[PDB]
Amino acid sequence: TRTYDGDGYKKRAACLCFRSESEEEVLLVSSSRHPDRWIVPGGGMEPEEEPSVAAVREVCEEAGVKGTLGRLVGIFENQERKHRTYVYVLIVTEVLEDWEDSVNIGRKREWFKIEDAIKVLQYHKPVQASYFET
Ligand SMILES: O=P(O)(O)O[C@@H]1[C@@H](OP(=O)(O)O)[C@@H](OP(=O)(O)O)[C@@H](OP(=O)(O)OP(=O)(O)O)[C@H](OP(=O)(O)O)[C@H]1OP(=O)(O)O
Numbered sequence: 640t641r642t643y644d645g646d647g648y649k650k651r652a653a654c655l656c657f658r659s660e661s662e663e664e665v666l667l668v669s670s671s672r673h674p675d676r677w678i679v680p681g682g683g684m685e686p687e688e689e690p691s692v693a694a695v696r697e698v699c700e701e702a703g704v705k706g707t708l709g710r711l712v713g714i715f716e717n718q719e720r721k722h723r724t725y726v727y728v729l730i731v732t733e734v735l736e737d738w739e740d741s742v743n744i745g746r747k748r749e750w751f752k753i754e755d756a757i758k759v760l761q762y763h764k765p766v767q768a769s770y771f772e773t
């Protein structure tokens with residue numbers, strides 16, 4: 640069940656999944672609808688689901704990782720798609736080999752240096768590229 644803010648924006652949560660506390664490498668995953676494109680893992684908040692809880696669930700489902708949830712980075716709107724996304728830092732401590740989206744849709748994942756992540760996100764996901772602005 641998709642949820643919405645009072646203005647009709649879709650409620651979403653996302654994590655910047657870092658390899659370490661240095662935050663130099665981030666995990667991106669393949670788009671479901673276009674598998675040669677990279678996205679930040681994230682998705683819809685469920686009814687009455689806390690954003691931090693939604694972000695951890697979405698990263699487990701889409702990216703097959705777990706770890707230590709850090710700070711909220713910010714709340715980012717995509718006016719074109721009508722999304723409002725809570726974006727958190729996660730430090731990855733567990734990498735699972737056969738996760739929900741790997742089994743269900745063959746979703747891929749890959750470590751990117753921050754500057755390379757921003758580069759591959761820019762064309763199709765410029766708001767996701769802005770998650771890294773800091
Ligand atoms: O395929 P696109 O370009 O139409 O974008 C897709 C995007 O696909 P992607 O970023 O993968 O290309 C999905 O993400 P996902 O299918 O990879 O999960 C994303 O859904 P979401 O991430 O908000 O939703 P869920 O992860 O499932 O909760 C939205 O899909 P949905 O609304 O069918 O759940 C988005 O569509 P809009 O909300 O209309 O922008």
Ligand SMILES: [Cl-]
Pocket residue numbers: 657658659660661662663664665
């Ligand atoms: Cl790192």
Ligand SMILES: [Mg+2]
Pocket residue numbers: 681682683697
């Ligand atoms: Mg989802």
Ligand SMILES: [Mg+2]
Pocket residue numbers: 680681682683701
């Ligand atoms: Mg999603």
Ligand SMILES: [Mg+2]
Pocket residue numbers: 681682683697700701
């Ligand atoms: Mg999802």
